């Protein structure tokens, strides 16, 4: 549907299958947020129907053991001072240590300001112990969320049930003919578009030699020349349009890793799934009663929300026990008025 | 001949032909392949689903002319109207904060430091003390803009072409009524919000049928929208008919609209000729059930008021 859904599909942890569970046998205790999910699974992004809790998403900083156990990083603290040495811990090793909280006041030298801090003890127990006995600390406040949940501004002000829908509905957006980036963002939108892979990046450094609507030619410093082609109006798995456009000039200098061409839901390298509109919060004559919405006509006369959908049809010509089917313009059953748009 | 299905249209943008004689891989038994691509451009309309990043979700009820829309003091119409009754009871107040910050980012601001940095802006960086119109900002997921900062920025925004500030320190503005002309009596919240278009469009969900293809074993209408099928009248929908007392509607819905093969044609002829609708016959699924029961070595028969089993096969 769009790059975000493709990236999210490849990061899914599924509890069903030949060797796991069943949608009918699974009860209510395998669909709960265990205290050991902190940093390994996202507690918010999950389906809304009969598969609630049976499908989840990996967190941003998580990684897998050579055995199959998910790890997560921490910062080691000694003598009340936070160091900068990162150690990856599995859920079976972090229950013997006191782990602090990401939102903790830290001075210039690295000592806690508050006398007592909120920690996590052995059995996922929350306590208020003082800043002299902790042994580890979190790496960032977004350690426990996935790639689509980390794209909601002001998430800490929203309930879990509504944030669940907000994360689920970002994967159902359609590409529009023109894209524009949010006025208010989060900063995850730049590396969520490069890693998805629907843009074109440069594999070496050089200057741009020729630019057209379907190819870019880059001359490297050593002498080699590389050309990149574009997919113009390609059909995706869901009938949407996947179009790539160049965003460079004819004399620019390009560094390795720079974004060279845009994509379906991209605006200058960052993901853009919607548009910025001027809002009013008020009832109006009952036309927005019970979750309805009133729009303006400037959004139809100016192509603000317009999308292109492509379809595909096939047919086959084969042999028969009575002969062989043939594709031809000559049909002795129908008139000549409906055979005017056919070629030779 | 390959024809366009029901309710489709659009230009033709590509043809890919595969042949056997020109050394192309093909399934055995076929001689030529061809694919046709058809594209269309879809605008926004009633029934289409919109959404935000916080859980807001609804379909479009009306589209209004730009002269029928509430407008600001300089004549700027608004683009979308959302209701206020759904916010407090669902505990998603991030959307209002987003609209406030979006207005501040769109208009641009500047913090005065003639007598030193104000007390509320002590922890702000030095590059966030001034911004240009149509600026882009970033508020991380669990460490972002506080409420003292938003409240202080809402009173620093720049004016427009004429030296006017339309939105006051609370984020509220006075709007005019585009149908009657009088101002609205109380200030209203205004701002900018990020709206996405969801892939649930009304053009792919409308369907209707009078008659069409039928099944083979049980001669009921086919199912689905691609095959021009009918709508199921399930078990729970029969209980409502039986609780209303409607004995004729249910009988017509169950015999001459689903299974009565001989009554289906006569009903159509009666409707076309303008006469009275005939009397229902007997459904085919009952006969299929009886022939199913007889194959398990069960001697099931339909008797009359004095024995003498009825044939139940027509044919005469």
């Amino acid at each position: 549907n769009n790059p975000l859904s493709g990236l999210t599909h490849k990061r899914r942890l599924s509890a069903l299958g030949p060797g796991g569970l069943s949608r009918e046998r699974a009860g209510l205790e395998v669909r709960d947020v265990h205290p050991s999910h902190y940093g390994r699974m996202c507690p918010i992004e999950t389906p809304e129907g009969p598969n609630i809790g049976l499908i989840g998403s990996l967190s941003v900083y998580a990684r897998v053991n050579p055995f199959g156990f998910i790890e997560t990083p921490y910062r080691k603290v000694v003598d009340g001072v936070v160091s900068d040495e990162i150690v990856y811990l599995t859920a079976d090793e972090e229950d013997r240590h006191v782990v602090a909280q990401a939102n903790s006041p830290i001075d210039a030298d690295g000592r806690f300001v508050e006398p007592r801090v909120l920690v996590r003890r052995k059995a996922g127990e929350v306590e208020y112990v003082p800043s002299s006995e902790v042994d580890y600390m979190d790496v960032s406040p977004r350690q426990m969320v996935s790639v689509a949940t980390a794209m909601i501004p002001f998430l800490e002000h929203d309930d879990a049930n509504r944030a669940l829908m907000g994360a689920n509905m970002q994967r159902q957006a359609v590409p529009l003919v023109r894209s524009e980036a949010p006025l208010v963002g989060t900063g995850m939108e730049l590396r969520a578009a490069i890693d998805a892979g629907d843009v074109v990046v440069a594999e070496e450094s050089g200057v741009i030699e020729e630019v057209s609507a379907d190819y870019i030619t880059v001359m490297h410093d050593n002498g080699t020349r590389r050309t990149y082609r574009m997919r113009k109006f390609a059909r995706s798995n869901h009938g949407t349009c996947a179009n790539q456009c160049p965003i460079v000039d004819a004399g620019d200098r390009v560094e390795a890793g720079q974004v060279i061409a845009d994509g379906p839901c991209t605006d200058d390298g960052e993901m853009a799934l919607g548009k910025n509109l001027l809002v009013a919060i008020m009832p109006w004559e009952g036309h927005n009663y019970e979750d309805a919405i009133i729009l303006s006509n400037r959004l139809v006369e100016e192509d603000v929300l317009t999308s292109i959908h492509i379809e595909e049809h096939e047919i086959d010509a084969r042999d028969t026990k009575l002969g062989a089917e043939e594709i031809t313009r000559d049909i002795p059953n129908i008139s000549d008025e409906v055979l005017a748009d056919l070629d030779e | 001949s390959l024809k366009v299905p029901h309710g489709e249209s659009g230009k033709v943008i590509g043809i890919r032909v595969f042949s056997r004689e020109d050394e192309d891989e093909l399934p055995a038994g076929v001689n030529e392949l061809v694919r046709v691509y058809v594209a269309q451009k879809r605008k926004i309309s009633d029934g289409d689903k919109l959404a935000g990043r916080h859980g807001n979700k609804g379909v479009i009820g009306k589209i209004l002319p730009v002269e029928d829309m509430p407008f600001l003091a300089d004549g700027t119409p608004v683009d979308i109207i959302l209701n206020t009754h759904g916010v407090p009871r669902r505990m998603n107040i991030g959307q209002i904060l987003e609209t406030h910050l979006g207005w501040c980012a769109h208009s641009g601001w500047k913090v005065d430091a003639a007598k030193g940095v104000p007390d509320w802006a002590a922890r702000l960086p030095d590059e966030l003390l001034e911004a240009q119109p149509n600026a882009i900002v970033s508020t991380p997921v669990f460490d972002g803009a506080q409420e003292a900062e938003l409240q202080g920025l809402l009173s620093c925004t720049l004016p427009n072409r004429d030296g006017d500030v339309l939105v006051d320190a609370d984020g509220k503005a006075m709007l005019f009524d585009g149908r009657s002309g009088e101002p609205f009596p109380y200030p209203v919240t205004v701002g900018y919000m990020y709206i996405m278009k969801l892939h649930h469009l009304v053009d792919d969900k409308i369907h209707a049928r009078s008659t069409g293809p039928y099944s083979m074993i049980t001669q009921q209408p086919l199912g689905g929208k691609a095959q021009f099928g009918g709508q199921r009248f399930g078990e729970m929908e029969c209980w409502a008919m039986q609780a209303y007392g409607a004995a004729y509607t249910l009988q017509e819905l169950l015999t001459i609209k689903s299974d009565d093969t001989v009554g289906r044609v006569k009903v159509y002829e009666a409707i076309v000729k303008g006469e009275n609708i005939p009397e229902p016959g007997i459904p085919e699924s009952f006969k299929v059930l009886l022939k199913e029961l007889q194959s398990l070595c069960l001697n099931v028969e339909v008797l009359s008021s004095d024995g003498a089993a009825i044939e139940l096969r027509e044919g005469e």
């Binding site: 900068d84 960032s140 590396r191 890793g257 720079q258 | 960086p125 966030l128 508020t139 991380p140 460490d143």
Partner: peptide, 21 residues
Amino acid sequence: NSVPGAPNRVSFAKLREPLEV
């Protein structure tokens, strides 16, 4: 940041990060 050519998006964050995703 950390990408050669990227739009300049100013941030409200008050914490620093010792690791990259």
